[PDB]
Amino acid sequence: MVKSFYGYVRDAWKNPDETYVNELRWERLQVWRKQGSVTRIERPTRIDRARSLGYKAKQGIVVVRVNVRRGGLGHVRPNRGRRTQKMGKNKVSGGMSIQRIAEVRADRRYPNLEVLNSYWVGEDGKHKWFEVILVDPHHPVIKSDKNLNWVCDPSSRGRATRGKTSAGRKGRGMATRGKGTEKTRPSIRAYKSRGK
Amino acid sequence: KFDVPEELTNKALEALELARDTGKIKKGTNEATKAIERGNAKLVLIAEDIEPAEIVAHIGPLSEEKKAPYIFIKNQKELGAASGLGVSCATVAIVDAGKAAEMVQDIAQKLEALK
RNA sequence: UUUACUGCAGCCUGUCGUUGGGUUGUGGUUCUGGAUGUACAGUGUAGGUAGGAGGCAUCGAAGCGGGUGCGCCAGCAUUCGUGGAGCCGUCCUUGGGACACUACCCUUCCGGGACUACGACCCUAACUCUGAGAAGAGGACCCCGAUAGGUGGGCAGUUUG
RNA sequence: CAUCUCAGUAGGAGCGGGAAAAGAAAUCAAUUGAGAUGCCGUAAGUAACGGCGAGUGAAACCGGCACAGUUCAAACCGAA
C-alpha cells in the first residue's frame, strides 16, 4: 500500500480513545478547559479532517475551536397555564444540535467571515469541542481561489445562521432523498415546520 | 530510547545537506510517508516540535514497520533549512544519499545501537 | 383548598458518561505436572467411548521411606536410591464400566498465570474550593448531562352529573 | 375534558436578497423501468395517524412551467 499521512491521521482518530489521542486528549482538555468560548488556532487539530471538509493552507482561512455545554435545551418551566403535554420541559431537548450551536457561536464571534464546516475535536462530561473553518470573502486570496470564490456571493453570507452548512442540512433533514424527506426539502419553513 | 547524541544529530543534518547537494530528499510529511511506505527512504528525519502531534505521530511506527532508519530533530525550522526550504518541515526522507551514503549508513548503525 | 383526577417543577435514590493509577477480597476467564477412575479384588488402575485385540524392556520392568501424580501405608510411571521379569487375554478376576506404551477436548489440578462485574482501602494526575501567586484543602468523590423509580397542591390543567 | 385539535398557528430570537431556500440520488420504482432541484395540476380527503372519537393527513406514478451541469478531499507529481 501507498497511503497518505492523512490516512494515518484518519486511522488515529477513528477510535481515538484506543489510540494515543486518548492520552493527548487527557493533557489537551486541561488546556482547553482554561480557554474561553471561541479560540483561534494556527493549525487544525485533525489536518486530514480539515482538508476533506475544505480547509486549505492559505490567506483568509481561519480555524477556531468552540466550546459548547452538554445536554439538551436548558429550558424554563412555564409559569402560566399550559396543557399537561406542554408543561413538562426537562426531557425536552432542542432541535438545534450542539455542532450547529458551536458553528453559530463562532459566526457571532467572527462577523466578517462565513462558516464553511466544522468537526468534532473533543468532549468531556460537561463540554464538547468543535473546530469551525471560516472564510474571508473579502480577502484577495479567497477572491482568486476558484474553489472558494463562491463564498463572495451575496447568498453565501449568513450560512451558519440560515442553516446552509452540512450540519445545518443534517439538522434540517436534507441529508437524504426519497422517503422521509417529504416535509423537509426544500425547507423546514416551506411545510410549516412539520418535518423535524 | 536514550537521547540521541548532539553530534549524531548534527551528522544527520550534514547528511541532509549533502543529500540536497547530490541525492534525493522528500521534504514534507506526506512525501516522507509515501517514501517510507514505498521503501525508498534511506533516512528519515522527524521534527520534535510538531503541533498537533498527530502530524508525525505515525512516522516512527511506520519506519519501524518498514525497517527505515529514523532520527528526531530538535525542532522543524533547522530541519526545513537542512531540507533547503523557506518554511518549516515536520519530516524529511533522504531517499538518494548521493555521496552521503556512507554517513547515512553510519547514522543508521548508530541509531540501531542506541535503540 | 385537599388523603378528587391527571400531570409538571424541586428534592431523594440506582445506572451510564464525566473517570484515572495501585492494593487485596470475591466468578471464571484460560491451561500447564497427572487422565488422577477403585461395588465385587485385581496376574493389572475401564491407560476415557476405542481397528473386541495385540507394543515396549538391564541401551529399563516391581513388591520400600512422609509412598513427588493418586489411593484402602495395595500398585501402576523407574525418578533420590536399592531390590534382580510389568506381557496383551481366544483360562477376559461367569462384564453398572472388562482393560494393547497408540495426537488425554471431558467431574480433577490450587502457577491459576492473564482481561473481567461487585465490594473495601490507598495514590494524584484529572476534576473541585481558597488565594494575585508559591501553595493549602478535598479528590476520581462531589457537581454536571442522560436515563430509572420514588416523594411531591410548591405549581399547571381540569372535573366535581 | 386530559391524548388529540386549535397548531408548529399567534408571538419571540438570529440571518438575509431582489428574490431566498433546494438542487445534480448511498433516489424513486418493481418483476425488465426512470434519471438534478423547485413550482403548479392530479393522485386525494386516498394510504397513514387518532379516547380508531372529533379530527389530522401525505408521497410516488403521471400531465405541465422551466431546464444544466459541476467543483473539491485522496490516489500520481512536489512549489512546478
Curated annotation (Swiss-Prot), chain A:
Gene Ontology CC terms: cytosolic large ribosomal subunit
Keyword DNA repair: no
Domain of life from the UniProt record: Archaea
Gene3D superfamilies: Ribosomal protein l15e
Disordered: region residues: 153-196
GO terms under biological process: cytoplasmic translation
GO molecular function, one term: RNA binding
Comp. bias regions, Basic residues: 159-172
Alphabetically ordered keywords of this record: Ribonucleoprotein, Ribosomal protein
PANTHER family: LARGE RIBOSOMAL SUBUNIT PROTEIN EL15, RIBOSOMAL PROTEIN L15
Family under the similarity heading: Belongs to the eukaryotic ribosomal protein eL15 family.
Entries under HAMAP family matching the protein: Ribosomal_eL15 (MF_00256)
Protein known as: Large ribosomal subunit protein eL15
Organism: Methanosarcina acetivorans (strain ATCC 35395 / DSM 2834 / JCM 12185 / C2A)
Source lineage: Archaea, Methanobacteriati, Methanobacteriota, Stenosarchaea group, Methanomicrobia
From Swiss-Prot, chain B:
GO CC aspect terms: cytoplasm; ribonucleoprotein complex; ribosome
Localization of this protein: Cytoplasm
Pfam families hit by this protein: Ribosomal_L7Ae (PF01248)
GO biological process, one term: ribosome biogenesis
Primary role: Multifunctional RNA-binding protein that recognizes the K-turn motif in ribosomal RNA, the RNA component of RNase P, box H/ACA, box C/D and box C'/D' sRNAs.
Similarity comment: Belongs to the eukaryotic ribosomal protein eL8 family.
Protein name: Large ribosomal subunit protein eL8
Organism: Methanosarcina acetivorans (strain ATCC 35395 / DSM 2834 / JCM 12185 / C2A)
Lineage: Archaea, Methanobacteriati, Methanobacteriota, Stenosarchaea group, Methanomicrobia
